[PDB]
Each structure stands twice: as structure tokens, then as C-alpha cells.
Amino acid sequence: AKIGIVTVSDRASAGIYEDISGKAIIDTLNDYLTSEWEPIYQVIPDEQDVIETTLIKMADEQDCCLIVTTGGTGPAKRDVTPEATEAVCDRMMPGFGELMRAESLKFVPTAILSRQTAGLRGDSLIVNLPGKPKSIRECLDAVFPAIPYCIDLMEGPYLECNEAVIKPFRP
Amino acid sequence: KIGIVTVSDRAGIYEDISGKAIIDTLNDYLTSEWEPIYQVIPDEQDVIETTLIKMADEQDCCLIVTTGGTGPAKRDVTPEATEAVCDRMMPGFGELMRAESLKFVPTAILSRQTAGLRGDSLIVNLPGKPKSIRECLDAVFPAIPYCIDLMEGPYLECNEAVIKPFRP
Amino acid sequence: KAKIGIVTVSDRASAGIYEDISGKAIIDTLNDYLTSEWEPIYQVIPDEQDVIETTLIKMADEQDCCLIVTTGGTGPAKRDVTPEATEAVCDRMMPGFGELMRAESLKFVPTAILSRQTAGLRGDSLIVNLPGKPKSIRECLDAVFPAIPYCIDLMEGPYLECNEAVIKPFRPK
């Protein structure tokens, strides 16, 4: 089981900020999973071609059953993570953005400003998350319960979870 | 006249709990006469497109409902075929169907179901499981008789005691 | 100074006689909200996709409207092309807006799912499709306007200020 983790951010990629977002993803997936898995981690600038390049590499060459991104989903000019995700996917999963936004609105009205989306590239699920750790955990909690079954639907690795933390639904 | 399309990758002879749940629900809803135009077909994007086109253009179905071919596997190509034959999409349908379906089947977020209009016909993608089909229709049908009204199609009447459609 | 575009999309309102309650309702609502100075950039136009595009383009690009709200032309009838025009002039969509407006309208009217309104960015201008009824205009705006001043700060635009007794915008520290 390989899961990709992409932090998208000029400042985090500069070695300016410490990367609290990519931290929260790895730590969350660690609380979630009891099966064996391998984190493939990268921090990259707000550059669309680079986002597209690094998603293709993880999915095509490294067999990530799942890639999660953080950053680059708001209305700022340089936020292009969703455009990059749309470009490298062959089909979109509109239910992910819908739910992540609906959950985040329990917290902040500005949840409607995220353009986060999800889609499939071959047998890889790609899911965009926002920058803030608290939002990361809340987005993953909303959406993760359905991810293992998605992977099984494309005959990928059988992800098993610590059920006291996250409960995967398999019909 | 309502079209019902089962998109499955079997192989026709089997009982089809998807199609009958659609027929049963429409039967509970409506107090006016209607004719189901039923087809089962493979998940081949051409065959789905062809079927939808025939029901809308040639057979004049006011509503066409699909079940199947809407999930994440590569072969699930129902939403693709629906966008192919429709000239305008209705984003509200999918949002509401997923948001009601996921109250019970958390994996409803994996559905790529959508809806749109081909000329005057409304096409709606539904999921495979009967209980989900019923949830999806309970959420959206209250809008459908008005929508058909605006397409100057037939005036569908409901048993107000099972479902209350809105006519502003 | 904030410039806000208001576009009324109606064959019959632009023919002229035939006064525009729905654009007035939008301007009224924005005055209810704002305590900071703004200018409304207002136009009434026909249900014609090329005229809609041309208007949205001028407002965003020449008139430097930081927010543009449209009213009319988002139902299932084939002459309703405001969403098509909006999609054509925007570089990226804001799907949170359509989702929420429809979910807020569903509280009142089952038929909110027939609405095709959307929202998007053209450069640094936000464009939002509103419904036609004055009361629905107010309910859609109450739902989305709390995100809009922060959205505009993120686009390096003017700092909008609100009357908190009326509307509470979130800006994260």
C-alpha cells in the first residue's frame, strides 16, 4: 500500500514555513491505518506544471493507490491545485468536494471558497485538502470512510483501519 | 411515458431489483397513467448513448431514469453518456442525491451520478441499490413534475399523501 | 473603493417598461450589508449569451468590479443562458457557491434543484449567479456573502466592511 502526500505552497517549499499541513496528513493516516503502507512525501511550489508532474509520478511510476494534496485550492491567483488535479485525472469524483465543503461549513462560512476536488487517474484516487491542520483532519474524517472501498473497487490494496479511530464502509 | 435504463455488465436473464425498485416507486408516487419503457444494456458508452437518444427523440419519454454504471470502476460510463446526449446539465440533482444517499450509504460520495435535459427530456442517473434508488427519488421527484411542466410535457399527478410535488 | 457589478438578465426588463425589482433588491441588500464605501456598476440586458459575456467582461476587466452579481436566466428553460455566459468568462469556478445557494433554497422550495446558478473567478473578480425573486436574492446572499469580503482580500482587492447586526463575514487571523 503506497499513499502519496503533496504539500503545495511557495512558502513551505522555500524552506520558509515548517510544513504543519503535510505533518497533519501523515499523522492522520498513521492514526487511521493498521495495514502496511508507505508515505511518498513531497513539498512543491504553487506551480501548475510541477503539481501535474508530481501527481503523474506518484500514480504512474510509484503505484500510489491514494494521493492527498494540501494547499492551492482557494481563490488566490496562485492557487492552482484543483486545475492540476483536473488535468491529470481522467474522471472526477464530484461527491468529495461536496462533502468536504459541507462539513467545513459547520466551522467557517469561508468553506465555500475552497475549490478542492477529487478524481481518478487510472487506479489512483487523488483528493485535494485545504492548508490548515484542523481542516485537513476534518476533511479526511468526512471522506476517508469511503476511500478503502473505492480502492477495492479498482482492485487495489486492502486498506484495514483502526476502527476506534476511523470506520470504513464496505457495502 | 418514463424511460428506465439498467446499465449492467452481465451476461439480461437475471432478476433486476434496480429496475423494479424504480417501477415500484414511480407507482407509489403517481395517480395518473404512465408507461415504463424499459431496457437493460451493457456498460458500453455507445449503447447507453443510443438508448437514451431513442427514448428521448423517438419515443418521447418526458423523464428517463438510469440505474448503474455510475461508480469509480473504469467501465462505469453512465454519467459520460448522459453528458454526451444532454444539451444542459442540472448540477442540483447529483448534489442532493449524494447528500441524501450518504446519510445511509457513506460510499454515496463515490457516485458520479448526474442529470440533464436533452431538448425536452429529463435524464436522471440513479444508483444500483433499491434503498438508495428510493432515497434518491424521494429527494428529487418533488421537483420533477414542475420541470416536465416547463418542458411543456405531460401534467403528472401525485398521491399528495405519498409525495408532494411543488408547482410555483 | 469597492466597485460591485449588478447585472439584470431579462428580455422583458431590458425592453424597458417593466421595472427592475430584482436588481433594486440586490442593491438594497448590499447597502444593508455594507458600511464601507462602494459603487454599484449596474446594467439591465437581454437573455442573450454574447451580451451577458460582453457585460461581465467589461465589468471585470475595465471597470475593476471586485464582485459581480447577476440576476435572472438560471432556470431549466433553454433561453436561460446566464450560467453558460458565466462559465465562458471565468478562468475557474467556485463550486461551493452553487452547492450552498441551492441547499439554502431547498429549505423553502423543492424546485431549487432546477436552478443552474454558478459562481466563478475572472482574474481577480468574483462573479455570482443569483435567482430572480427579491426574497430569494436575499436568502442566497445571506448564505454566501459571509465568505465574500475574505475572498476579495485574498484577491488583493478592496477591504469590504459590514454592519455586524445584519451580516457577520468571517476573516481568519
Side-chain angles (χ1 to χ4, degrees), chain A, chain B, chain C residues 1-172:
Chain A
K2 314 211 273 311
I3 309 179
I5 294 100
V6 183
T7 296
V8 185
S9 166
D10 281 344
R11 272 173 219 124
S13 204
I16 287 165
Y17 298 149
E18 271 148 19
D19 185 18
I20 64 165
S21 315
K23 179 191 170 155
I25 301 180
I26 297 167
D27 274 344
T28 302
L29 292 185
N30 224 24
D31 288 343
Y32 279 5
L33 298 157
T34 50
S35 76
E36 183 88 89
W37 68 286
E38 192 198 325
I40 327 283
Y41 168 72
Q42 189 112 300
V43 190
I44 57 163
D46 286 308
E47 288 298 318
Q48 200 182 322
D49 299 321
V50 190
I51 310 164
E52 294 186 19
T53 281
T54 134
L55 301 176
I56 295 161
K57 197 194 153 78
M58 279 164 187
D60 294 356
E61 318 198 299
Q62 310 179 287
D63 283 338
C64 290
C65 60
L66 176 64
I67 306 151
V68 322
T69 71
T70 178
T73 76
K77 199 190 176 199
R78 73 196 182 285
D79 289 4
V80 281
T81 299
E83 293 93 312
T85 306
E86 271 137 38
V88 316
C89 293
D90 49 76
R91 65 215 181 287
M92 300 318 281
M93 306 276 276
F96 285 74
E98 287 166 7
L99 209 217
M100 298 181 288
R101 274 177 300 270
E103 297 294 310
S104 299
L105 284 154
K106 296 169 182 202
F107 298 86
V108 300
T110 36
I112 68 177
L113 304 178
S114 174
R115 296 177 297 105
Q116 58 194 323
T117 189
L120 309 152
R121 184 184 173 91
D123 52 351
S124 312
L125 180 50
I126 301 163
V127 186
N128 305 146
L129 301 182
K132 252 136 204 279
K134 174 185 196 176
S135 317
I136 288 174
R137 181 48 111 118
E138 277 319 302
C139 292
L140 282 171
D141 282 339
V143 130
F144 198 80
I147 278 178
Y149 190 59
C150 191
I151 296 167
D152 294 328
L153 283 173
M154 23 226 20
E155 304 162 51
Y158 201 85
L159 271 36
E160 289 166 36
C161 298
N162 190 169
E163 226 146 47
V165 183
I166 199 87
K167 258 256 43 154
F169 192 72
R170 294 162 158 123
Chain B
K1 277 159 84 150
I2 326 288
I4 297 155
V5 191
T6 304
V7 187
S8 88
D9 229 359
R10 310 229 259 0
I13 347 97
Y14 309 103
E15 157 173 51
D16 166 40
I17 60 178
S18 292
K20 221 186 159 22
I22 294 162
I23 284 158
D24 283 342
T25 298
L26 294 164
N27 267 331
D28 289 332
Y29 291 168
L30 298 153
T31 52
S32 38
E33 293 175 1
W34 71 281
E35 173 187 348
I37 300 89
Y38 173 73
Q39 284 267 107
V40 231
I41 60 174
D43 38 16
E44 268 100 83
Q45 204 182 320
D46 298 350
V47 183
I48 309 177
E49 288 176 9
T50 301
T51 301
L52 295 173
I53 287 160
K54 148 84 149 205
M55 295 181 161
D57 296 358
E58 286 200 289
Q59 293 172 311
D60 252 353
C61 300
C62 63
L63 174 50
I64 301 149
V65 185
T66 66
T67 172
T70 253
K74 224 71 172 291
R75 69 192 179 293
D76 285 8
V77 287
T78 306
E80 283 84 359
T82 305
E83 303 227 0
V85 310
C86 281
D87 56 78
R88 51 186 27 234
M89 301 320 283
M90 312 260 275
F93 279 76
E95 288 157 3
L96 211 218
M97 291 179 300
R98 283 180 291 272
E100 303 296 22
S101 279
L102 72 77
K103 287 180 160 139
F104 312 92
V105 165
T107 47
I109 69 168
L110 303 185
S111 173
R112 310 170 51 246
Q113 69 202 132
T114 190
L117 295 156
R118 179 178 174 87
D120 64 7
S121 305
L122 180 67
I123 304 165
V124 178
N125 312 147
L126 298 179
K129 138 52 93 182
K131 118 144 212 36
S132 291
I133 290 162
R134 184 58 173 258
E135 280 312 306
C136 285
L137 282 172
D138 279 347
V140 306
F141 207 88
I144 290 158
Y146 184 62
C147 192
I148 293 171
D149 281 359
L150 297 175
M151 301 319 110
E152 292 183 290
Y155 188 83
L156 330 65
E157 278 160 289
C158 299
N159 170 206
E160 346 106 47
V162 274
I163 186 148
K164 336 208 167 215
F166 187 62
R167 297 192 153 100
Chain C
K1 319 168 216 229
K3 295 157 101 190
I4 299 166
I6 299 93
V7 178
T8 301
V9 187
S10 170
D11 277 344
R12 274 141 90 269
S14 66
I17 205 163
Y18 270 120
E19 85 137 305
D20 180 29
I21 46 78
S22 83
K24 135 141 151 87
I26 287 179
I27 285 160
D28 280 348
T29 294
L30 290 166
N31 283 340
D32 274 348
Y33 290 172
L34 293 161
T35 56
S36 49
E37 277 163 7
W38 69 292
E39 178 163 8
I41 308 297
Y42 175 54
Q43 294 268 108
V44 178
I45 58 171
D47 284 304
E48 219 81 55
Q49 180 181 337
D50 51 348
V51 186
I52 316 162
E53 298 185 22
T54 298
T55 313
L56 295 182
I57 294 172
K58 161 146 175 174
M59 292 181 169
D61 282 6
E62 290 299 62
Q63 291 178 303
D64 303 321
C65 296
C66 61
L67 170 73
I68 304 167
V69 293
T70 71
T71 170
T74 58
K78 33 237 267 94
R79 66 195 292 265
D80 286 15
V81 300
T82 305
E84 277 87 349
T86 304
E87 208 112 14
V89 308
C90 292
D91 313 306
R92 61 262 256 257
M93 301 317 281
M94 298 283 275
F97 282 66
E99 303 163 358
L100 210 214
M101 297 183 290
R102 275 180 298 269
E104 292 296 312
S105 316
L106 250 113
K107 304 191 190 213
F108 306 96
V109 284
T111 41
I113 81 176
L114 302 180
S115 169
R116 306 201 314 128
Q117 49 206 251
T118 189
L121 315 168
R122 179 173 179 82
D124 62 347
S125 291
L126 176 62
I127 307 172
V128 186
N129 302 156
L130 303 178
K133 286 169 209 230
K135 74 94 217 133
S136 301
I137 282 162
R138 189 51 180 261
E139 290 148 1
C140 284
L141 277 174
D142 285 357
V144 301
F145 202 86
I148 288 177
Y150 188 50
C151 186
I152 296 169
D153 303 350
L154 284 177
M155 289 172 314
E156 298 181 331
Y159 190 93
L160 280 49
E161 297 177 324
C162 291
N163 181 141
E164 307 178 56
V166 178
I167 190 139
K168 243 258 123 299
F170 180 72
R171 290 133 172 319

